[model samples]
Target: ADQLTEEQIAEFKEAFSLFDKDGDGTITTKELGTVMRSLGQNPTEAELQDMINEVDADGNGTIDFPEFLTMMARKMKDTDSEEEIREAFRVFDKDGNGYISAAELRHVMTNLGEKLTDEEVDEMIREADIDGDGQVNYEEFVQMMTAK
Candidate 1:
């Protein structure tokens, strides 16, 4: 984050699009869950749906880039530390192996804070763990956080 950069802003937007699979002007549970499955784990429908319902503001069963941007912007704006990125890595890195695994993320949440249901946490992880190693490493972490 060395003084940041304008190009970084564009990169951030691209990252949001990467997660917004539908490209139909919104990000849906199905789109997100599909991304998880591509990484090789099953997320219960209930959990996926719940995540979307919790994060999406429009009640349209989808999340738009603006919503995503707002969320990330808040976290980034207060960057007195890498706390936000670290926390995300922690959630994604369930095994504490400097990487994030679907099942590991689930375990971390259940055993730690948020304490979401096992299924619930796994769904969250699966949405971002794109490599199918059941987890995402530092490289994948950056890719998910800042790529489209």
Candidate 2:
């Protein structure tokens, strides 16, 4: 939706290439689903379709470079740092609840193709659950993601 810094442009190109699984210079809706999961979230098929419909301006049912750029630009334009992180948390929280439960974390990671053990999930939750709660709230989620 706006001009990008050269670095940001390069970053987008790299990300797009990752999503263009077959090197066809376009990402199918399936590819988008994989990309979403790889980013640690599992979108429902309906959500994937909606994304494709919104971004595939040419009606080819695939996302090309310009369409990808438009989608990213619009997304980047939609929020500031805090809001962006909140939105990212929302993506991870598939249930739309204010917190991310350990089960939800495990579910999304598994959907992303990670065969994680329950112990591993427990460890992750413990590390991120700063308030001694069993779930990760938005603040802890952002902190966990951004922490070194």
Candidate 3:
């Protein structure tokens, strides 16, 4: 991130454009959530708030392009390798629906001899089910675990 190549910088700008649907140089929180869902993520209000909080240097509710870049760089710093995250998703996506449902989570954790409460299950879904569809798809899971 410290040594972003020209191509990488351009890539960031491209991504910013994609997120900034109104093209006003800043992205509203709602717009961020919408874009995340379009990109296959299930972002919760809390998650989006956290993101905005972390990078909203000017105390603004929305994120400017430069703030988005900083946020992305910070996020990239803690992400696991994409391959590793994918493998983890595969393990969790039982039933082969390419997503992790509340039922799947319960079954897997129960099989592993750990019982999770309904509340816990709900929390997991709330956090990762960006579309609020009560499941964590691969993209949402990746974005959650990866891009901070």
After superposition on all C-alphas, the RMSD of every candidate to the true structure, in Å, is 12.9, 9.1, 13.1
Per-residue lDDT of candidate 1, residues 51-127 (tens digit): 66778555576666556555446545667224544565566654667865545534444444442455543444566
Q: Estimate each model's TM-score.
A: 0.33, 0.43, 0.41
lDDT of 2 by residue, 28-113 (tens): 86677765565455768997677777666676777777766665566556452445555656778777777787566555555544
Question: What TM-score should be assigned to candidate 3?
Answer: 0.41
In model 2, the worst 10-residue window by lDDT is 139-148
How displaced is residue 96 in candidate 3, in Å? 28
Q: Where does candidate 3 stray beyond 4 Å?
A: 1-12, 19-23, 80-148
Best candidate, lDDT-wise? 2
Cα error, candidate 2, residue 21 (Å):
5.0
Models sorted by lDDT, best on top: 2, 3, 1
lDDT (C-alpha) at residue 111 in model 2: 54
